[model samples]
Target chain A: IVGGYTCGANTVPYQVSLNSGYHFCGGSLINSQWVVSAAHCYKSGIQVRLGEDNINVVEGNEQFISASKSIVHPSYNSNTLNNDIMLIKLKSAASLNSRVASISLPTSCASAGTQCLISGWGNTKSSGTSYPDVLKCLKAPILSDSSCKSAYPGQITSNMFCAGYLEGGKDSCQGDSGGPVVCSGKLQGIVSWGSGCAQKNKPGVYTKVCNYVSWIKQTIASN
Target chain B: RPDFCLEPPYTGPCVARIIRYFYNAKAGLCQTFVYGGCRAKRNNFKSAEDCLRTCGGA
Candidate 1:
C-alpha cells in the first residue's frame, strides 16, 4: 500500500494473502473456514495463506489452503463496482493461534471520520512494479459520504464508502484489492477500488460491510 | 435457466455448500454444480450469463 510502513509480524493475524501462485489480493479471516474479500479480486486457482508476514518465505506458523468455493454478492456490478464484496471458503478450517485468528465484523456502522487501518502486500508506489514481501499498513480516516460522493461524482453508491487523505499522500494501491479496512478492531470495509493510488480528492473506495451483515450471516449459514 | 444460479442457499449458520458455474470442456458449454464450499478453480461465475459470457454458451 502507498505511503505505508512495514507492519509487525503477525500483528494483524487475521490478514491473509489471496494468491494465484502469488499474492494478488489481501483478505481477512472472518472464520476458521471463511475469508472475506473483494469480488473483483476473484480468479481461478486462487488459494489463501495465513499467519505469515512475509509471503515469500515458508513461515512455520503459516497455513496455506486452496479455496474450495467463492461467492460474489448477487448485485455486484463490475461496471460501476457496486457491491464489490466476496467470500472465499477455505479447504480446511484454520488453526487459530496467536499467529492466526479471525477478525470480528462490525456490530454497527462506522460514523464518518473514524480512523481506520488498511493492510496489504500491494505495491508501494502507484507506478511501481514490485509488491512487498512483507505486509504494509497505513492509517486513513473514513470520509463523509458527501465528501466521497463529491470526489467520485455519481460513482459512489450506498453499498460503497470512501476512506483516505484528500491531500493524497496515503492510500491503498493496486494489488491491495480485497484487503481489510479495520476500524475499532472491527472489519468495516473491503478495499474495493479508487481513481488511482493515492490521488488528491479521490480517496479510496471500499465495500461497506455493515450494510450487508445480514447477507453475510445468511450466506455463511445456508452455504 | 436464470442468468444466475438460484440465489445460493442463504440459510443455516454452518452450511458449507456453494453453487458455482464453470465451463464443461467436453460439453462445450458452461455448467452449474454444487461445490464443497471450500475451494474451486476459476472460470466459476455468479450467473448463467456470466458463465456463458466468460466461457461459452450452450
Candidate 2:
C-alpha cells in the first residue's frame, strides 16, 4: 500500500501474495485452504504465499501453497470490474499459527467513514515504479457510496466501494488487487481498482465483500 | 408437502455457482438452476429425479 509502513511478520497473518515466480497480487486467507482475491488477479500458475513479511526473505514461517483451483465470480464483468472477487482453493491447507491464519468476514455491513486497515506489497510510488520488499499497511476510511459513484461516475457499482482520503496521499496501487481491507477486525473489502494510485477525488476502490459473504460461504460449503 | 413444489426456486443472495435442480410447478417438469448454497428454503435438490419424486405429482 502507498504511504504505508512496514508490517511485522505476524502483523497481517491472513495476508497472502499471489506469486508465480514473483509477487503480482495480494490475497486474504479466509480459510486454511481457501483464499479470497480479486478476479483480475487470476493467473494459470499462481501460487499463494502465506505468513510472508518480506518477498526477498526466506521466512521459514511462510507456506507456499499450490493452487488446486481458482473460481471467479459468475457475475464478474471484465469491462466494469463488477463483482471482481475470486476464490483460490489451495492444494493443502496451511497450518495455523501466529504467523499464519484465516480472517473472519464482516458480521454486519460497514458504514461510511468506517476505519479500515489495508495492507499489500503494491507499488508505493504513484508513478508505479517501486514496490516494497516487505508487506506494508495503512489506515483509510470508507467513503460514502454515492460519493464514490460520483467520483467514478457510472463506473462504481453496488459491488464496489471507495476508501482512502479524498485529498489522496494513501491508497492501494497496482499489485494490491485482491488484498484485504479489514474494517473493525473483519475482512470487508478486496483491493480491486481505481483511476490511479491515491489521486485526488480518485480514492482507492475495493470490492465490497459484505455483498459476497453469502457467495463465499455457499461456495465453500457445497464445494 | 406439495406446497414445497409450488414455491419458486431461490438462489439466495450469494453468488456460489452450484448447479441444482428445482421443480418448475407450472411446467410440470424439473428444471435446473444456478444455485447458491445459502438458500434458507428447501425447494432445491441435487438432481431432477430428486425434485421430481417430491414435487412431480402436482
Candidate 3:
C-alpha cells in the first residue's frame, strides 16, 4: 500500500492473509469458511489467517485455518486480467465477530469517483521491498473506464477497474493481490495488477467483483 | 480556466464504490457523495479540505 498507513489491530475484520510460514497474499473472508482472493495467488496447502493486524506477532485474535479447496474463475483471462477473482474454502469455518467477520458482496456496480478503502501487507515503496508487518490501507477513488483506458490503452477491460490518483502517489502493489477494496462496507475490487507501485499516471487496476457474484454463489453451492 | 466546484458529481459506469467529496455550488459547501469508479470531472475532491481549498470554503 504505497502512500498508505498501518491498520489498527483487527480494525479491518474482513481482511485475511494467505500464509504458509509467513504472509504472502491478501484475501477477504466472505463467509465463515469461504475466502475470495486474486486467481493469480493460487496455491495448494495455503492457510488463511483471520483477525490479524500484524503478521510478525502471535496475535491471539488470529484464526489460522488451512484451505481445503481453491477455485479460480473458469473464464478468467490472464492476458487482459479479466475475471481475476478466486475463492478458497477453509478446512474449518472461522468464528465471526467484530475482530473477525465477513464482508458483504456488492449488489450493484460502483460508479466512478467512488472513494474506497484498500487494505493489505503489500510493499509501501514503489521500489525495493518494504512490506508492512501490520496491515496498511490507502483511501483512493475509482477512475472511470474511459479514464483508465486512456491511462493504459488497450489494457483496461469491462472486468477490470482502475483506482487511485491520476498524479500517482497511492496504490496497491506486490503482496496485495487478492486483497479487498471495500466501499459501502462491501467488497468491490480485488487487487489484481498495476504498472509499478504508485507511479505517475499509472493507477492501480482491480478485478470488477460485481461481475462475478452469481458465479461465487454457484461455485459455493456446487462445492 | 474553470471553477471545478460548480460541476455536478458524476458516478462512472463501473461497479466499485469510493467515498468522495464535491463542492456544492448551491449550498456553497463541500458535500459528501459516493464516487463510482471512472469518468469524474474536476468537481470531485478526495477530501473535504481539498474541496474547501479549491472551492473557497476557507
Candidate 4:
C-alpha cells in the first residue's frame, strides 16, 4: 500500500500467466469478457487468469479463461513496441463482484496532471526482483505532456506517458508492465517501459491509452 | 499526284488541323493558342491535314 491510488482501488486485478512458468504482469478487467494488458507481456501460450494475487501460483476462486484472441495495435512493433497496449477477449464472461470487481474502460481521457493509482506484483524496491505473492500498490503522480517530454527527452513519444515519484525512487517495476495506471475511477495508462525501475529521474513509462481510444473501440467493435 | 511511299502512312484529319494551329500560333498570329484552333484555322487541305496529323506525331 503506497497510498497513491486515487482510482481503481476496488476493482479486481487481472493476473496473466505465461507458459514459461513465469506469470508475467498486468491486466485490468475492462469488460465482462475482456481484460486489458500490455503487448509485451503477451505470449502465444498465455491465459488471462482472473482473481489471483499471487500470479506465480494459481489458487482459489481465480477464474482461468482461455484468451481466445488478443488484439494488439496494428502499429505495435516488438522492437519499438510503441502503442504497446492490447486487449484479451476471454472465452467467457466473468462474474463481476460488486465490492471488488470489474471496471469500465474510461471514455474520457486522463489530463496531463491527474494523480492515479498503479498496482502490480512488481518489486517495491527498485533493484529487487518481482514480489512473488503480494500485489503491491503504489502512489504515482501523472506527469504532464510537457513535463514527461522534457524529463525523458528522446524516449518520450506522444504515444507514451510517465508516472512515479519525482523526488526519486519508487516506481512500477519489472512485473508491472501492462498494469493499470488509473485515475478518476477510469483506466488511464498501461505500464509500458521505464528506466531502472523506480530510480530517480527514471519515472515509469506507460502507453497512453487516450491516443488509441478510437482504435480500441473499433478493434473491440469489429471483432 | 503519285505518292512515293506505297500504302501511304496513316494520316488523320484531326491531327492535320492541330499541327497547323500549333505552327500558326508559334508564328504569332493567334495571341492565345487554343486547343480547338487546330481544326478551325486549316489553310491548306493537304498541308493543314499533314501538319495537324504529322506535327503531333513528329
iRMSD in angstroms, per model: 12.5, 11.8, 11.4, 33.0
Please write out the lDDT profile of model 3 over residues A76-181, one tens digit for every residue.
7755567888899999989997999999999998999998999998778876657688999899998899999998899888899999998877888777888999
Q: Is candidate 3 or candidate 4 better by lDDT?
A: 3
TM-score: the better of candidates 2 and 4: 2
Comparing 1 with 4 on lDDT, the higher-scoring candidate is 1
**What is candidate 3's CA lDDT for residue A92?**
91
DockQ preference between candidates 1 and 2, better one: 1
Q: Which has the better TM-score: candidate 3, or candidate 4?
A: 3
lDDT of 1 at A24: 68
Clashing pairs in 4: A4-A139, B15-B52, B15-B53, B16-B49, B16-B52, B16-B53, B19-B52
Compose the digit string of candidate 2's lDDT tens values, residues A58-176.
86888898999999999988667789999999999899988898999987789999998999887787664576888999899999999998888878888888999998888887667
Number of the predicted model whose TM-score against the real structure is largest? 1
Which candidate, 3 or 4, has the higher DockQ?
A: 3
Clashes of each: 13, 0, 20, 7
lDDT of predicted model 3: 0.82
What's the TM-score of each model vs. the native? 0.79, 0.78, 0.78, 0.70
lDDT of 4 at A88: 81
Give the local distance difference test score of model 1: 0.79
* Per-residue lDDT of candidate 1, residues A15-110 (tens digit): 999877567678999999999998877778888999979899986788989999899999887667788889999998899988899999989999
